[PDB]
Structures are given as structure tokens and as C-alpha cells.
């Protein structure tokens, strides 16, 4: 079952999709799944309708990519790496496992953006926010 077929089955309703404000122009949608970098309900970003996916979540930052020949076996579907180095070294590994490999090069900018937000979130976790970012 290819990703295009899976997308049409899960597009309308989903255990991870959150919809709000009805079906007018007011509608706001998001996705809750991991391996969904921007948490957006779209084919490009969906963690359910794509064979190759990247997950950038904290724990230390865990990067996870899925194996294409292990779709039928969920227990071995995720190849996970845990990195505790400096940001640039982590940013280099994300570019290596996502861009240079040709494993979803279209996600290299969303993945680096999410790694920035996750690393920044961890930065303030150890030392509380001493300045607010309104400028």
C-alpha cells in the first residue's frame, strides 16, 4: 500500500489530526504524531502516509528515521540515534542522515528548523528564561 493510497484514507479523519472551528474559513488543523516535523496535516509532512520520515524529538536530542524495508515490522521500523553534542555537530548529523543521503531531501529545512526549536527548548529547560523574545 503506497503512500498516496494511505494519504487518501487518513486525510479526512485521524487519531492524530486535530481540527478546530468547524469547516468554514475558520478551520484550523494540526497533527499530533511524532515524525511530523511541523505538526501539519499534509501529505508532505504526515507521519502516517509516508514511507520515509524523520523525527526530531528531545529525550540530548533523539533523531529517528524509518526503514523502508521494515514497514511490515513496526518493532524494527525506526532507526533511532541519540545525540548529546554541540548544536552544530547535531545539525551536521541531521543534514547527513536526511539531506546528503537523499533520504527525504525536501525535509532538510523542516528538520533543521525543528532541531533548532528543540535544542532551544532544552536550553531554557536547564536554565530558566531570563529574557523574553518580543523584538
Amino acid at each position: 500500500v503506497p503512500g498516496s493510497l494511505v494519504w487518501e484514507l487518513v486525510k479526512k479523519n485521524n487519531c492524530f489530526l486535530i481540527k478546530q472551528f468547524g469547516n468554514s474559513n475558520a478551520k484550523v488543523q494540526f497533527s499530533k504524531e511524532p515524525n511530523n516535523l511541523y505538526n501539519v496535516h499534509s501529505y508532505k509532512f504526515s507521519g502516517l502516509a509516508n514511507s520515509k520520515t524523520v523525527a526530531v524529538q528531545p529525550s540530548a536530542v533523539v533523531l529517528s528515521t524509518t526503514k523502508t524495508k521494515k514497514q511490515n515490522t513496526p518493532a524494527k521500523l525506526q532507526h533511532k540515534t541519540l545525540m548529546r553534542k554541540e548544536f552544530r555537530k547535531m545539525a551536521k548529523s541531521v543534514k547527513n542522515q536526511v539531506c546528503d543521503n537523499y533520504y527525504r531531501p525536501d525535509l532538510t529545512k523542516p528538520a533543521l528548523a525543528r532541531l533548532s526549536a528543540v535544542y532551544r527548548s532544552l536550553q531554557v529547560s536547564k536554565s530558566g528564561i531570563k529574557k523574553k523574545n518580543r523584538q
Binding site: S4, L5, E8, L9
Partner: protein
């Protein structure tokens, strides 16, 4: 103020998508939307339009029609119908034909394959004939329906052979006073 009808807007309606919700048909529509955008083929443009059509606008085609429309031109020619291929017991010889259709009956699929032919889907015809080269586009009989027999002029006007809507058939069901000269008139 400018003198126009309905403001100049188009009042005719047409289908720009299939009314059905079949995901495999939605995937066919996406594929053929791409083909008519970037190949500019007249054949692909017709396929996309018929993929939107309703059930009564895509009549079934039988084997008898197919084996006669594809008579000598069954080598290097794929028959294309946007609809269903049904079987026909009234014929005995079935040549080897390449046929693509939305659906085959299990008797028609068996008849084609046993004769040496192939049954293709429209996603397979796109690989073989991306621009529809060396193909025969076919349609079933649009007006071979019992409903169409009641269409047209009213049954009670001269020169009309429209079917009436009668609950039963017999001598006591609409055969007197309007159907023969011995009772009034005969329209």
C-alpha cells in the same frame, strides 16, 4: 450598469470532478490531471473528462461490440473504454485483444485472457500509451436503456412511439379510446 445576462457569468454546468468517493478513482484522476497538463494530448483530455462521468453516462460494453469494433485492428492497438466490459454468450470466436477498462466482469476477464488478450487498468495504459498512441477509444450505447424509451414526445401525440408508464401489460391496460379507431380515436 452594463447590459449583460446574469452578469456575463456562465450558467451551463459540467463536472470538474467525480461525484463518487472511490480512492482508486481519485488516484486515477490525479494521474490523468497531470498527463493533460504536461503532455497536451487530445486523447488524455477525453479520458479525464469521462473519468468524471456518472454511471448512466458510462454504459457497459459487451464482447460482441468489442470483437466487431476491433475486428482487424487488434494488433498494435489497445481498446480503451471508460466503463465496464461485460461478457456475451451469443458469439463463439474471440480474437486476442488488448483491452483497458474501469471494470471487467469475471466472465469477460476469463474470455479475454483465455483468448490470449490482456485486461489492463488505466494506470497500466498510461505506462504503455502515455499520450494514447495506437488506441481505439470506445463507448457503449448511451440510449440503450428502458428509461430512454419513455423519453421524448408524449405517448399520446401523433408520430410518437414513446413508452407509456403502465403498471401492468395486457388487454385492460391502456389499449382503448386513444389507441384504436373503434374506441374514439387513435393518436
Amino acid at each position: 450598469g452594463i447590459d449583460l445576462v446574469a452578469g456575463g457569468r456562465n450558467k451551463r454546468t459540467k463536472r470538474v470532478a467525480p461525484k463518487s468517493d472511490d480512492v482508486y478513482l481519485k488516484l486515477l484522476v490525479k494521474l490523468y490531471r497531470f498527463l493533460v497538463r504536461r503532455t497536451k494530448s487530445k486523447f488524455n483530455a477525453v479520458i479525464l473528462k469521462r473519468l468524471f462521468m456518472s454511471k448512466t453516462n458510462r454504459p457497459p460494453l459487451s464482447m460482441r461490440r468489442l470483437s466487431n469494433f476491433m475486428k482487424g485492428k487488434e494488433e498494435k492497438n489497445i481498446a480503451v473504454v471508460v466503463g465496464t466490459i461485460t461478457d456475451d454468450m451469443r458469439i463463439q470466436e474471440v480474437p486476442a485483444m488488448k483491452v483497458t477498462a474501469l471494470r471487467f466482469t469475471e466472465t469477460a476477464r476469463a474470455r479475454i485472457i483465455n483468448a490470449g488478450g490482456e485486461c489492463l487498468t488505466f494506470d497500466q495504459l498510461a505506462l504503455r500509451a502515455p499520450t494514447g498512441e495506437n488506441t481505439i477509444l470506445l463507448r457503449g450505447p448511451k440510449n440503450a436503456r428502458e428509461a430512454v424509451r419513455h423519453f421524448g414526445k408524449a405517448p399520446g401525440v401523433p408520430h410518437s412511439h414513446t413508452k407509456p408508464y403502465v403498471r401492468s401489460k395486457g388487454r385492460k391496460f391502456e389499449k382503448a379510446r386513444g389507441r384504436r379507431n373503434s374506441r374514439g380515436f387513435k393518436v
